[PDB]
Amino acid sequence: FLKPRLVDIEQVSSTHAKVTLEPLERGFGHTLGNALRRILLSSMPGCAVTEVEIDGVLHEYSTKEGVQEDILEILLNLKGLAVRVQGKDEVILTLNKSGIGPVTAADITHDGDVEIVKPQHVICHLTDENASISMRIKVQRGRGYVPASTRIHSEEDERPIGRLLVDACYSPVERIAYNVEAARVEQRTDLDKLVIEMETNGTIDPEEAIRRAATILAEQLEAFVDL
Amino acid sequence: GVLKIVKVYLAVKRRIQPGDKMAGRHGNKGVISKINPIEDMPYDENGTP
C-alpha cells in the first residue's frame, strides 16, 4: 500500500514536458493514468477571448480599411494566441498598431496580469501606414469548450452591436500519452513507472495542473466515500 | 410599379453538428451520429489521437 510519488518534471521544451512516477502498484498506474488523461483534458481552467469590440467593425463579415487579412480570419488568429492571467479571471486589453508590418502580439496595452507565451504571434497584417487599428479584447477564464453559441442565450441584451464575440475554448492541455513500463526498484518483483508524456499550448503549469486536477478528483471522490 | 426595392443581406454561420451528412471522394457516404470529445479518441504509441 506504498504511497505514490513523482520525480522532477523533465522540461524538454517550454511547450511540452514529461513527469515520472516511481511508486506505482500493479494496475493502478494504468487505469488511473487513463482516468487522469480525461481530467487533464476537461477540468482545466483555460483562457479564451470572448468579446472583441473593434474600432470600425460592426460585424466580422467586413475587413478593416487598411488591413490585408479579413476580420473573421483575425478573430481566429486571436484564438491562436496563448495568453496567461494571474490575478483576475478577466481583463480587457487594447490593440494599437500602425505602420506596414506583420502585427506581432506585443503592441497591445500590456497589463501586468496579461501574459503572452509568445509576443511574436502575428494576429493581422497591416499594409498601410495611416491606419491605426484599435480593438478591446475581453478575455476570461473557465474550463472546457464553452462556445459563444451557448452563451448568447442569456445575451444580457447585447445592443452595442459593435461588440463582436468569438467561441471560448478553455483548454490549455493538448496531446496526452502515458508510457507504462516496469518500474525497477530492488525491493519488489516489479512496480509501475508512469512517464506521462504531455503536450500543452503553454499557459498553465503542469504541476499546478496535476495537483489541481487531482483535487478535482478529490471532489469526484467525495460522494464515492459517502454512503 | 415597385419604385423602391430593398433587398436585405443577412449573414448566418452554420457549423458542423451531429446529424449532418458527410462523406468522401471514393463514394463513401454517411451521417455523423455523435461528434465525440477528443478524449475518447484511440491514439497510437505517439500520443496523437
Curated annotation (Swiss-Prot), chain A:
The keyword Acyltransferase does not apply. Keywords: DNA-directed RNA polymerase, Nucleotidyltransferase, Transcription, Transferase. The keyword Transferase applies. Its EC number is 2.7.7.6. GO terms for biological process: DNA-templated transcription. It comes from the Bacteria. GO terms for molecular function: DNA binding; DNA-directed RNA polymerase activity; protein dimerization activity. Residues 1-227 are annotated as: Alpha N-terminal domain (alpha-NTD). One of its GO terms (cellular component) is cytoplasm. It catalyses: RNA(n) + a ribonucleoside 5'-triphosphate = RNA(n+1) + diphosphate. Homodimer. The RNAP catalytic core consists of 2 alpha, 1 beta, 1 beta' and 1 omega subunit. When a sigma factor is associated with the core the holoenzyme is formed, which can initiate transcription. The N-terminal domain is essential for RNAP assembly and basal transcription, whereas the C-terminal domain is involved in interaction with transcriptional regulators and with upstream promoter elements. Belongs to the RNA polymerase alpha chain family. DNA-dependent RNA polymerase catalyzes the transcription of DNA into RNA using the four ribonucleoside triphosphates as substrates. This is DNA-directed RNA polymerase subunit alpha. It comes from Escherichia coli O157:H7. The lineage of its organism: Bacteria, Pseudomonadati, Pseudomonadota, Gammaproteobacteria, Enterobacterales. The gene is rpoA.
Curated annotation (Swiss-Prot), chain B:
It comes from the Bacteria. Coiled coil: none annotated. Belongs to the RNA polymerase beta chain family. The RNAP catalytic core consists of 2 alpha, 1 beta, 1 beta' and 1 omega subunit. When a sigma factor is associated with the core the holoenzyme is formed, which can initiate transcription. DNA-dependent RNA polymerase catalyzes the transcription of DNA into RNA using the four ribonucleoside triphosphates as substrates. This is DNA-directed RNA polymerase subunit beta. It comes from Escherichia coli O45:K1 (strain S88 / ExPEC). The gene is rpoB. The chain holds residues 1045 to 1093 of 1342 of the full protein.
